[PDB]
Write a protein that binds this ligand. Sequence first.
Ligand code: BI9
Length: 258
Amino acid sequence: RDYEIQRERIELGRCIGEGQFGDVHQGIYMSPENPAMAVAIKTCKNCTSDSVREKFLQEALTMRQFDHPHIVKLIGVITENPVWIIMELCTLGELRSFLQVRKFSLDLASLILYAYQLSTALAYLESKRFVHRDIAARNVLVSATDCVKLGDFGLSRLPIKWMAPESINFRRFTSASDVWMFGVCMWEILMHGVKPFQGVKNNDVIGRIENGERLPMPPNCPPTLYSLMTKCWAYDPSRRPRFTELKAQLSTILEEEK
Ligand SMILES: CNC(=O)c1ccccc1Nc1nc(Nc2ccc(N3CCOCC3)cc2OC)ncc1Cl
């Protein structure tokens, strides 16, 4: 209904990042007779014009469209200077760091669960015909040890090493090129946050992909899950699974691994 929030309900905490328009903070949203809610706050640093303020706020209008357990929610906006966008906080931070730090504490079933949850968020977007374009582990947040979410779409935004050949060669971005990127995101997850094509130059990436090279099978990845990944990386977009297919398959693989 009304997304406008009184600034006095927000307590700005530490800086946790930055985007195009300004710093991102963690903070708190307070309301009478309720517990304080942890939030992320995107700020528009020195936005001293209507055109910049409008470009900033359109990122809120984008997030407002979505209602899914595995995509971060818009809580509200403050439309007086300085303009803030207030989002739900994923308290455990960025997935890549979480996987690196908690590696000897996480099992395969947990990694597969992260992939499944993300696939449900992306199937949801696919059903809305919304193309993400920026699917990578670095854009996934950790809400709890058993819960990951796509981060803010403004903050998520060329990522050559993640991109489908059709996106690199022809600038085509579709749900099918989303599927490719997700394949890479699943590889990152199984590798506990190692980046794809490490030590390889961006301009060389397409040469390798067109030569038929693909990211290798992670250690202790189930063959059935690597097979699903190689399907995501079919050179021909028409041959890749849809996110609807991915979610059903991942559901089966997860059950198998439990
Ligand atoms: C897609 N990426 C994002 O949306 C994003 C990127 C950088 C920083 C914040 C950020 N957005 C969020 N971030 C969070 N939670 C985070 C993210 C990063 C961190 N960090 C902790 C300090 O080191 C850097 C990253 C903390 C945190 O909550 C404590 N929750 C919700 C949103 Cl919408």
